[PDB]
Design a protein that fits this description.
Anion-transp_ATPase-like_dom (chain B); Immunoglobulin-like; 8-stranded mixed beta sheet; binds magnesium ion; 12 helices; 384 residues; homodimer; identical protein binding (chain B)
């Protein structure tokens, strides 16, 4: 199962591009799941149908679902209630929790959205959510809360390690920790399935496996989108390009989405080397004709690109000159801050409100001497 | 301190409206803070200035900050390292945590955004974050992650009280709770009484902030739409309903356009409606022209007047619960009863809202009828 998502400013065509992509992949023979996690009614208009928590099959290959956190939070509570019935740790307090009454709090949308995607795509383990034919989906297209939140998920796998290690330290090297951690570890074990020091090691390995997949381009694919007629939309795309790099990933292409009744202009100059394409999806009052849209010659390019991408570098090291070349589109030198908290072993990059640790090879290891921003790449010279 | 935010679909003029409002309030003499929590460069083009974590003063009354979770997390960690040194709860382990190395994970943007806004507005407690004159801001304008996430923030105070009840139970009615809760309640204290006092005061502090988030003199939300995009207008009606479901209210609706050229004032009755014309050119924006434009007099007046509160109505005679539910269809509104006939749970817009029914109205749902945009629920005894 592969994962596809669209990144861009509000009004840049993300939702339009997500539905277009889902229709294209389904028409092409791929079992496709379009996942919506928001309250924007645009998708329902584009699809010509109301979508809900239960899958809606547009055709035999296009399944659409709306995630609802009110419903998603119920399953974890049910599992926790099952564990407490075996361990009686809460003296029945958990059993009295009416999950059907609980409201959605800040942060819950992002966290539960991330949990459902794991079941659908299978980043950290094999996917468990199957399509209506009992098999796993071929493509998962995700139209999420926001570009910035989607980016927290893309780069999630790499950055969990340090959190888990600090948490293990607080569990195994503190009074209250050695007191609580035992039972908590026993409860999370029961709740998940149907010794403590050892439970922490397996967890760390399970985290490492998730970074191999989320990094694997044969699992995740990101596309930039922009309204070609809005200068702010184009500029935001370039910014989100660098935010994607800073998340630890890459962009697979850039699209100019025109939902108006005009031919889609292409501002292809600023986004090379990315493959560029445009799409014309007019918002007709009588309902979209997807047969016509998908067959329009103007969309032939984007359709090919989409299929070639699912069909199948940010750092370049120079061992001789002691250099780390960091591609940083959408950023200015002033916005990129370099830190070193682990000696010459690693280099931390701070930009776009995200931190990225770049472990340095033996030859490059050292302290930062200077840096220069040429074009859109920062050349960092190391000193030994 | 007052709070202002704009709700609408992507590309509907939210950020444009927020910068317009910030300029208007500062010009009216109010100490204004424009808070941006996202990586969208649009605000900088609109303001004509780079924005960062440190405040940028467009004028003596207009401060602009971009929040950054990487930085927002460091200071709270510092406060937690102090309490650990005193109470010795972690035995120096917390002191070894390198906040400056940690990456932002899913959910942290929302949590830390919510914390910073509390310091700036002071809904639960008195505002802590002061302007450059050492005084609380008069107006906080928030342009956040997304409309949906901002609605989770608007509803927090009304929906935590249930979570807090269950957490107090786990702390006072379980063996692990009775053993650890006392120590944990102390550590929280210093970081910022008796444990039962703490819980009792928390529950008061929670309802104190829910009253502030319901106060029209402290919180104002506005719908924005592009009047030439039907999806933008429909989205505004939907987020109106989501605001009601969050436990709050909308104070007005704005049609933002980049030109002076079919406003849907009638579709948003009884909200005060106004249009706004914010022309822009690549060279930048002429805010003196935009703010003196007579086409923008109405939006400026509506912003200045503010600086439906009742969405649930009870009829003790006919035994009815009338729910203002704009933007929803009868099929998108679910009504559940988990406490017998004493309560009514409304599920809509991926949010739940609990209505405690007056003793007279109490009973079981026996019919619902959508009238205009109000759901009339007949309660059967
Ligand atoms: C200001 C508002 C703050 C809100 C902060 C964000 C809260 C969201 C936390 C939700 C995480 C719940 C745990 C979870 O979903 O894991 C699911 C896990 C996987 O099961 P499976 O399907 O793979 O067999 O199966 C399980 O059931 C794991 C159960 C063990 C972990 C329980 C953690 C409970 C967290 C709830 C916290 C609520 C805070 C208000
Ligand atoms: Mg769109
Ligand atoms: Mg805008």
């Amino acid at each position: 199962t592969k994962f596809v998502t669209f990144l861009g400013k509000g009004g840049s065509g993300k939702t339009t591009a997500a539905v277009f992509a889902a229709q294209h992949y389904a028409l092409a023979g791929l079992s496709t799941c379009l996942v919506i996690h928001n309250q924007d009614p645009s998708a329902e208009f584009l699809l010509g149908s109301k979508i809900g928590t239960s899958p809606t099959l547009i055709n035999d290959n296009l399944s659409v679902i709306r995630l609802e956190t009110t419903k998603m939070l119920l399953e974890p509570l049910k599992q926790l209630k099952q564990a407490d019935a075996r361990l009686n740790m809460t003296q029945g307090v958990l059993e009295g929790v009416v999950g059907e009454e609980l409201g959605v709090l800040p942060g819950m949308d992002s966290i539960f959205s991330m949990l459902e995607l794991e079941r659908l795509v299978g980043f950290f383990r094999q996917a468990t959510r199957k399509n209506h034919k009992g098999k796993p989906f071929d493509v998962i297209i995700y139209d999420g809360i926001s570009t910035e939140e989607t980016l927290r998920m893309i780069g999630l796998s790499s950055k969990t390690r340090l959190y888990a290690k600090y948490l293990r330290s607080l569990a195994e090297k503190t009074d209250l920790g050695r007191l609580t951690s035992p039972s908590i570890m026993r409860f999370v074990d029961e709740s998940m399935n149907i010794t403590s020091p050892a439970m922490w090691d397996t967890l760390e390995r399970f985290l490492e496996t998730g970074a191999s997949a989320w990094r694997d381009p044969e699992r995740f694919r990101s596309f930039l989108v922009m309204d070609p007629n809005n200068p702010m939309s184009v500029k935001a795309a370039l910014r989100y390009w660098g935010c994607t790099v800073q998340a630890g990933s890459h962009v697979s292409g850039a699209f100019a989405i025109s939902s108006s009744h005009l031919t889609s202009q292409i501002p292809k100059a600023d986004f090379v080397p990315l493959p560029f394409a445009s799409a014309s999806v007019p918002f007709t009052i009588t309902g979209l004709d997807w047969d016509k849209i998908l067959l329009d010659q103007a969309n032939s390019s984007i359709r090919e690109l989409l299929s070639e991408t699912v069909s199948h570098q940010t750092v370049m090291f120079d061992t001789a000159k002691k250099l780390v070349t960091l591609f940083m589109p959408g950023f200015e030198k002033s916005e990129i801050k370099l830190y070193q908290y682990r000696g010459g072993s690693e280099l931390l990059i701070e930009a776009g409100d995200q931190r990225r640790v770049i472990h340095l090879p033996s030859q490059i290891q050292g302290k930062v001497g200077g840096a220069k921003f040429v074009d859109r790449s920062l050349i960092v010279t190391m000193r030994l």
